[PDB]
Amino acid sequence: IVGGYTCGANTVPYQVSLNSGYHFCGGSLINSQWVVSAAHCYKSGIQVRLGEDNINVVEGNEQFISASKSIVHPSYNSNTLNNDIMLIKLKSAASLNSRVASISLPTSCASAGTQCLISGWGNTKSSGTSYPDVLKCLKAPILSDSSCKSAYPGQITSNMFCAGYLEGGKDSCQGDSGGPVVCSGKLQGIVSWGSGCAQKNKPGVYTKVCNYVSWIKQTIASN
Ligand SMILES: NC(=[NH2+])c1ccc2[nH]c(-c3cc([C@@H](CC(=O)[O-])C(=O)[O-])cc(Br)c3[O-])nc2c1
Numbered sequence: 001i002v003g004g005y006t007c008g009a010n011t012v013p014y015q016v017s018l019n020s021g022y023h024f025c026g027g028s029l030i031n032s033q034w035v036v037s038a039a040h041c042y043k044s045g046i047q048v049r050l051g052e053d054n055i056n057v058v059e060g061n062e063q064f065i066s067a068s069k070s071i072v073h074p075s076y077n078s079n080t081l082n083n084d085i086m087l088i089k090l091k092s093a094a095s096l097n098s099r100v101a102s103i104s105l106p107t108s109c110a111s112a113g114t115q116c117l118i119s120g121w122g123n124t125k126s127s128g129t130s131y132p133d134v135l136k137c138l139k140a141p142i143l144s145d146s147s148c149k150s151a152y153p154g155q156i157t158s159n160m161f162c163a164g165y166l167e168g169g170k171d172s173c174q175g176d177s178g179g180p181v182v183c184s185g186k187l188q189g190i191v192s193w194g195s196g197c198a199q200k201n202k203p204g205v206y207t208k209v210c211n212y213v214s215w216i217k218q219t220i221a222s223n
Pocket residue numbers: 040171172173174175176177191192193194195196197198203204205
């Protein structure tokens with residue numbers, strides 16, 4: 001997260017860190033046994049880390065659980081990042097409490113201008129890599145479809161939305177991929193891609209979760 005602030009330990013209780021011997025992507029806990037992340041974060045050997053704040057130090061509240069299976073959307077296109085969503089089933093259920101809790105799926109899509117909270121342990125520099133130890137937060141608004149398409153002509157599908165600041169300076173970045181975009185207490189987006197980080201006129205692009213609620217429910221139900 002570039003231009004964000006320190007969230008504060010466990011203030012984003014649905015945030016998870018996907019670890020394969022190091023932090024590589026974020027995710028969101030949607031129930032005690034399932035996490036939603038981005039399909040481009042797929043790999044084998046994933047350990048899901050819940051109740052984290054400082055990813056380099058065990059401080060208490062952490063729960064490390066191996067992923068039993070990862071289900072990448074069948075229509076995910078790695079070239080366009082269309083349908084960039086994946087569900088991870090945990091080997092055992094997480095113990096939910098105040099520090100570890102799930103986030104609700106939306107019942108409707110959000111409109112442009114809605115303010116949302118984006119969080120993660122991704123790069124904090126738009127020029128160079130500087131990864132933080134603790135969880136960073138950023139409040140960003142969802143942009144209009146016309147500003148989004150103007151910024152990335154021919155690259156935005158109906159399963160994506162832009163959020164951020166066209167003036168640059170504040171945005172999600174590499175390492176934040178797979179993480180949550182929460183608006184009014186509902187998970188509306190998944191950090192997917194962008195051109196660089198926090199560059200002027202190049203806002204972040206997010207997977208539009210409201211278009212996948214039925215798929216998520218159907219898939220969880222059958223697995
Ligand atoms: N501006 C954003 N909102 C944004 C969000 C997620 C991103 N994820 C990435 C991202 C970048 C890489 C680099 C590779 C590198 O330098 O290691 C690349 O261009 O392929 C790789 C991944 Br995987 C990313 O998710 N950039 C991102 C930018």
